[PDB]
């Protein structure tokens, strides 16, 4: 009954771990031995795991359970072990772990939305500067440039102060931020947004707010289903019918919301037959004063996907290293650019890795209650004789 | 006698101005009318110039003196005016303005070194992560990601705290920073460095310090002439002779200092016949443990030029938008990269533009005493009848 946390070697930016030091201290308090494979790549230092009770050791052959974040290289797999990561060995997949209602019980929580909102604010500063406008958004870095969300929140506060002081350029007009989805990632992105001088309005007020809104505030709206979903046949919205039959519905976001949106934070988790927020034809419609102080070429400036479908023209993803691309009027995707015409787009598949300490502590909190039954399992013995809960059992891939 | 501050249209990153609001208030207190051409690109907002007493006006035909930072487009030049910028019209060039000893009296001071040191610390974090090592340097953004040097200093303090807590990876070993030059840009880069847990040592101690130095500190050294300059014939250093005859001297930096240097901050202003710090052959010599915690491939990780010659293989410059490049073992320069083998290099020609408010206030402080004689000048009348000081007179290009 020995547990090991393997070293991540997926990519250079995988700095997360499946368990935090406080979780290792709890496991060692229960009487279980924990081996920690040394890793300079981890955002949490090896000495903090040692202080919690873990043993720093390269050879993890003694452990029967090996916990990692991402896939291990196939050659590094040890036979007759139980492995858990994101994908005679028993393999447990975190993403398959669900409760009796089917909701995932082990994830990174809101941190992808927190990181995504910082990134898009940073990207909006660069994009607006490329258009000729210095804004306080120039004073927000990328999410991974901050030690944690607290230090990032202070930077968002400071840029919010500049906006409330009236330091935004008057000619670009009011800024409107639209949040979609009901998951925890949308709550995380809204948490960062609430640190600005924000005012929340209903979707139907965007048309007026986008024109006459106060320039010392930013404006936000939370898009619910009933605001934009209509039946294909007669534009009716029925909550019960849409849940059972989403294929009968379309979205009027492209005409009712999109033209009045400066920045779209898309957190919708796309499912089968769910209507799309924007199509390629919508992008062409959306992309259709003084020399020193020009107006924006288009109202829509940026789109940030934090769900990692809804946006048909967003067929490619960006990375932490190259966070932004432009979708131009010729339907071309220009990678690692904020220049030219078009919409700034950000779609990073591992957002929580930009805030890896808080992402590790959140992931470990969710995983911790299922750890003990994993340690006591035996990969050589049949699955049916293991004392698993349905959460762990149904997550076994082998 | 009307003064105008034109709008900068050089590039998107030219956010500086030749005069700050406090300077405009002084000029208006003297009784002079100041026109401010509106600019969303300026880091200091138009309303702060209005509050100081300036008049926001696109047409600046009334002014006889037009102050800008960089070159104006040739078509925008107005005849029979006096212009001052960096390069029947009279043209004054800031760089030509010198005192009786020949020292420049109008410049951006230390701010290029302040910005350059932040950039290189940010670049070292990315480069070390690419090598497999998470370090606190990941929590320092680019200079232009900070509102001012105060907000940047706080981020350097916070990363310094992490280093003093022991969060650096042990396998990369001690970090040594070498500062060259005696100008104000070197003082600015040292000012940022002093916010880390630093200890200064003599150049001869680098050999030992680079091996056994405390890993909860960073180490710095200031390189003076007598540390590395030797006569070609007999390796003698004579201060008076080197000043008169630098062509008789060479630098032993490549063998005595370079092998023990983690990061070189080059502030030397290169002059005719001054010996080079490093050559192309030196780079080949410099580029000639556990799997989880490897050692550095080479001791030298990064070089940042803040002087904008000394380093023969640094034949190309980087930009604010693409700050870093790699010089590999094949003598190739890989732009916009921190990956692969080689030395990380940063050489931005307009560093102070990354801290444009403080750079503007510094530049304006130096320019302010010469402004009044420029306003009272007449570009149509002969230069010899103008009441100029030698500083302004000798700076006229026409």
Residue numbers in the entry:
A (entry chain A), B (entry chain A): 24 to 110, 130 to 330, 338 to 357, 361 to 450
What do the authors of the reporting publication say about this deposited model?
The LOR domain catalyses the reductive deamination of L-lysine and 2-oxoglutarate into saccharopine (EC 1.5.1.8), which constitutes the first committed, and possibly rate-limiting, step in lysine degradation.
Moreover, when we tested this short construct for activity, we discovered that, despite the fact that it was well folded and aligned nicely with the yeast structure, it had no activity in our in vitro assay. (a) Asymmetric unit of the short inactive construct shows a dimer of the LOR domain of AASS. We reanalysed the structure of the short construct and noticed that although the interface in the asymmetric unit is likely non-physiologic, the interface of a monomer with its crystallographic symmetry-mate is identical to the long interface in the tetramer, further supporting the validity of this interface.
